[PDB]
Design an enzyme around this catalytic site. Structure first.
Site, PDB file in Angstrom:
ATOM      1  N   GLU A  35       0.824  -1.209   0.000  1.00 55.63           N
ATOM      2  CA  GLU A  35       0.000   0.000   0.000  1.00 55.63           C
ATOM      3  C   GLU A  35       0.863   1.265   0.000  1.00 55.63           C
ATOM      4  OE1 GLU A  35      -3.105   0.474  -0.426  1.00 55.63           O
ATOM      5  OE2 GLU A  35      -4.088  -1.462  -0.136  1.00 55.63           O
ATOM      6  N   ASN A  46      -7.631   9.307  -5.715  1.00 49.75           N
ATOM      7  CA  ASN A  46      -8.491   8.384  -6.441  1.00 49.75           C
ATOM      8  C   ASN A  46      -9.314   9.108  -7.506  1.00 49.75           C
ATOM      9  OD1 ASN A  46      -8.859   7.207  -3.166  1.00 49.75           O
ATOM     10  ND2 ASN A  46      -7.755   6.082  -4.747  1.00 49.75           N
ATOM     11  N   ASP A  48     -12.497   9.111  -7.980  1.00 44.89           N
ATOM     12  CA  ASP A  48     -13.697   9.752  -7.454  1.00 44.89           C
ATOM     13  C   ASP A  48     -13.418  11.033  -6.670  1.00 44.89           C
ATOM     14  OD1 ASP A  48     -12.696   8.954  -4.975  1.00 44.89           O
ATOM     15  OD2 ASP A  48     -14.337   7.619  -4.486  1.00 44.89           O
ATOM     16  N   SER A  50     -11.575  11.212  -3.883  1.00 44.37           N
ATOM     17  CA  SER A  50     -11.093  10.909  -2.551  1.00 44.37           C
ATOM     18  C   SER A  50      -9.580  10.672  -2.601  1.00 44.37           C
ATOM     19  CB  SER A  50     -11.834   9.698  -1.987  1.00 44.37           C
ATOM     20  OG  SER A  50     -11.545   8.525  -2.735  1.00 44.37           O
ATOM     21  N   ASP A  52      -6.194   8.620  -0.483  1.00 49.70           N
ATOM     22  CA  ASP A  52      -5.747   7.602   0.464  1.00 49.70           C
ATOM     23  C   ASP A  52      -4.530   8.077   1.247  1.00 49.70           C
ATOM     24  OD1 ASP A  52      -7.692   5.891  -0.556  1.00 49.70           O
ATOM     25  OD2 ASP A  52      -6.289   4.941  -1.924  1.00 49.70           O
ATOM     26  N   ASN A  59      -8.881   5.754   3.284  1.00 52.53           N
ATOM     27  CA  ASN A  59      -9.520   6.601   2.276  1.00 52.53           C
ATOM     28  C   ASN A  59     -10.455   7.616   2.923  1.00 52.53           C
ATOM     29  OD1 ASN A  59     -12.162   6.856   0.343  1.00 52.53           O
ATOM     30  ND2 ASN A  59     -10.282   6.809  -0.866  1.00 52.53           N
TER      31      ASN A  59
END
Ligand SMILES: [Cl-]
Ligand SMILES: [Cl-]
Ligand code: NA
Ligand code: NA
EC number: 3.2.1.17
Length: 129
Positions: A35, A46, A48, A50, A52, A59
């Site tokens: 990750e 991301n 959309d 958002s 992380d 998120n």
């Protein structure tokens, strides 16, 4: 902070993640490797809108507030920036909420695609724990 493999394993064990909800320590170290490459300052945006955050790439659409994800929840009741600290306490406490939400560690796409079904104990092999 960029953790060493055994350094992070020891930190996660002290924070109660070994076998939490049935996931041995190797699972959490493997997830962090893919990750974030063990870097607490990792961020990724991301499609959309958002973002992380941190060592476990938590998120902003559901778990933390970053002030720029409209219509998001803040289920861990924390600013997303607190997830980038060299102290992993806030990331671990939030991960515990996530992994208890019903889908286990499948919530982390990289764990599903790169750790699940592999020899995860190899990630803690040789460490003094
Ligand atoms: Cl393990
Ligand atoms: Cl993946
Ligand atoms: Na180490
Ligand atoms: Na949010």
């Amino acid at each position: 902070k960029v953790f060493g493999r055994c350094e992070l394993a020891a930190a996660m064990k002290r924070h109660g993640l070994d076998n939490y909800r049935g996931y041995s320590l190797g699972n959490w170290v493997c997830a962090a490797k893919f990750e974030s490459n063990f870097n607490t300052q990792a961020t990724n945006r991301n499609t959309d809108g958002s973002t992380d955050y941190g060592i476990l790439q938590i998120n902003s659409r559901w778990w933390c507030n970053d002030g720029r994800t409209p219509g998001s929840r803040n289920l861990c009741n924390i600013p997303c920036s607190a997830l980038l600290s060299s102290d992993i306490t806030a990331s671990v406490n939030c991960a515990k909420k996530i992994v208890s939400d019903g889908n286990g560690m499948n919530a982390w796409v990289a764990w599903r695609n790169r750790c699940k079904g592999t020899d995860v104990q190899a990630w803690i092999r040789g460490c003094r724990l």
